[PDB]
């Protein structure tokens, strides 16, 4: 069972309204645990998980200062790309970055990554070798050259293989009770009438952690690939997740359809039916 540390980083310009907004949001697995937001009354790195209480003010100071340096570097980037793309000074633009690492259950690095976008399109990315870059257009080629000349990938690789892995192990230890838990889904089926003697049956799964889950509708020991609708698994506001999946069946035939729920927290998968 692997784990990941990811940061989602965004810088968004806003001509006429002051400095760009700048935000860093960090996750261990699917759980938000830290956040920095330049628009806050008092912009600083803040805990978003209770177990992060285990870090002393030194940590918060160090991270905040890094974040403030990152903010400055991204303001510079926004300006740089504006020029390279020969774009008006009047429009808003966005830079995005995802940065982080994944480790195995033994705490060993599996993969590291860092990928940039501009205005929502691939810009530059670190390759799997952690040594070389892939640029997506001609402006990114300039950045690629700068970073080759400055040895940026070796710097990044040292963070991804060193710092990133080490902090992730420590977060997993400190938040063990929260991060390593399993919450079993609780499920139920709803029924909605339709025109033309057909019914919607909707299977809900609630209150689960971690986020990975599978819901299926079966007819005759067979899985339904069509007329089946669903939503992406989503957070429920308390650090648990939910999902639903529906199928449209002939009225009067409801009892022949079953919903199946597979989850880390279910030694045996759930089987449910519409209960009139």
């Amino acid at each position: 069972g692997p784990h990941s540390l990811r940061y989602f980083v965004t810088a968004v310009s806003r001509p006429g309204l002051g400095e760009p907004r700048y935000m860093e949001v960090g996750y261990v697995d699917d759980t938000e645990f830290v956040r920095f937001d330049s628009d806050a009354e008092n912009p600083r790195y803040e805990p978003r998980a209770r177990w992060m209480e285990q870090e002393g003010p030194e940590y918060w100071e160090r991270e905040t200062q890094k974040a403030k340096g990152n903010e400055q570097s991204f303001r510079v980037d926004l300006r740089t790309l504006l020029g390279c793309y020969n774009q008006s000074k009047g429009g808003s633009h966005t830079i995005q970055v995802i940065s982080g690492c994944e480790v195995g259950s033994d705490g060993r690095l599996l993969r590291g990554y860092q990928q940039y976008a501009y205005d929502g399109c691939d810009y530059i990315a670190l390759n799997e070798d952690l040594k070389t870059w892939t640029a997506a257009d001609m402006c990114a080629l300039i950045t690629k050259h700068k970073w080759e000349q400055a040895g940026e990938a070796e710097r990044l690789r040292a963070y991804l293989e060193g710092t990133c892995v080490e902090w992730l192990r420590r977060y997993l230890k400190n938040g063990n009770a929260t991060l390593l838990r399993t919450d079993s889904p609780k499920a139920h089926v709803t029924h909605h009438s339709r025109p033309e003697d057909k019914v919607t049956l909707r299977c809900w799964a609630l209150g689960f952690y971690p986020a990975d889950i599978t819901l299926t509708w079966q007819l005759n020991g067979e899985e339904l690939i069509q007329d089946m609708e669903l939503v992406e698994t989503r957070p429920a506001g308390d650090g648990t997740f939910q999902k639903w999946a529906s199928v449209v069946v002939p009225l009067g035939k409801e009892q022949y359809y079953t919903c199946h729920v597979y989850h880390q927290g279910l030694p045996e998968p759930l089987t449910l039916r519409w209960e009139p």
Partner: protein, 99 residues
Amino acid sequence: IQKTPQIQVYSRHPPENGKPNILNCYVTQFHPPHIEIQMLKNGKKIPKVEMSDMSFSKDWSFYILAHTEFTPTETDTYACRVKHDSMAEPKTVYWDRDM
């Protein structure tokens, strides 16, 4: 390159009148990032809504959650109103306790 927000409203627990719960408004797959998201109780903005779980998918579109604590009653109505450049007018999605 504009992407229209998908808006979803749902409670943490199966709703029961008089029992504390959490109402969620999950706003997803949008771009650009500037957006306004309001939760409403009976047509009126709920104050002190938490914003959390900001992220992006592999195609770079933005995801974010708004949530607030609430206790449902038989007649209170809830909705999420979203304003975004991809849409000419604000979009309002209503909570459907029977969904």
